[PDB]
Design a binder for this molecule. Structure first.
Ligand SMILES: Cc1cc2nc3c(=O)[nH]c(=O)nc-3n(C[C@H](O)[C@H](O)[C@H](O)COP(=O)(O)O)c2cc1C
Ligand SMILES: Cc1cc2nc3c(=O)[nH]c(=O)nc-3n(C[C@H](O)[C@H](O)[C@H](O)COP(=O)(O)O)c2cc1C
Lengths: 147, 147
């Protein structure tokens, strides 16, 4: 009994490590960051989405300037997953998967304005910010569980 | 008329370009290759998947040795999207998106034998081949269509 109980302490520690790892990877805004989505007909999509910021422990805000299909999918089904994949293109791989649900679709506010400030310091500064998408974090997994 | 003919020609040249770019990137088997899937409840998953081969213009075969959730999703909905993304020192290099539908899940035959040979020459050589997944290619898009 206490052996299972100790394994749970352990698992909460693992979740905290994964959260902090996710925080650094997401806020780093690597160009190798994607968001996968789906429409009502089960057509899965994936697009590169890097203008991001993780707020607190359960929220990611995202700059939406392109991503037409990705945005449409989120409005229809609401579910998605972010992946930050880092690789040497040789032997090495690292990263994180953050499973998400769209919480808000904003055109103004401090969230809209803060992500707008972040967008202004990027190559896509010249692309009009159409939306600031707010996501709720559902689960964080390592890049690939392999037993 | 003339517009419809020239446009049909443009589409054909474009399609061949997409098929060839996809062929090269898929068959190279980069670490930075993924398969995004979904279940009946619209929950989207993404996993790293590089033991792959594109055959002709309509087929992708893939070794299934890990990827449990990915596999369960494919059996529920059958839909997915592969993405290859090359980035060098956080500089965008190239990539492709290949949209697919599961056609077959096999344990023997030409496809199984083919993907087995490939897997033998990998770090995952010791991982047993549980399935040869056969995909039909449904659409190929460039990485981003941002204007
Ligand atoms: C570089 C790399 C390539 C991989 N290629 C494959 C593959 O071709 N087929 C497979 O079944 N698993 C492959 N894996 C292992 C899966 O990514 C791993 O089993 C993962 O946990 C599956 O995630 P899932 O449970 O969300 O489906 C690969 C892993 C890495 C790091
Ligand atoms: C490195 C990189 C980062 C990008 N980041 C974003 C982003 O943060 N938000 C966005 O809307 N589009 C971004 N894009 C553009 C989308 O990927 C592009 O609009 C894509 O075609 C959308 O795909 P979709 O129509 O299937 O949703 C980025 C593109 C690149 C190459």
């Amino acid at each position: 009994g206490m052996l299972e109980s100790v394994r749970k302490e352990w698992l909460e520690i693992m979740d905290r490590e994964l959260l902090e790892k996710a925080r650094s990877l997401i806020n780093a805004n690597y160009i190798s960051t994607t968001l996968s989505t789906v429409d009502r007909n089960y057509e899965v999509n994936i697009a590169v989405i890097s203008v991001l910021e993780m707020i607190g422990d359960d929220t990611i805000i995202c700059a939406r300037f392109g991503a037409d299909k990705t945005y449409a999918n989120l409005k229809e089904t609401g579910k998605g997953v972010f992946m930050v994949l880092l690789t040497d293109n040789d032997k090495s791989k690292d990263g994180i998967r953050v499973y998400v649900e769209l919480s808000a679709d904003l055109q103004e506010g401090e969230y809209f304005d803060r992500i707008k400030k972040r967008l202004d310091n990027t190559t896509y500064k010249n692309f009009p910010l159409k939306n600031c998408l707010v996501f709720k974090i559902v689960k964080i997994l390592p890049v690939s569980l392999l037993r």
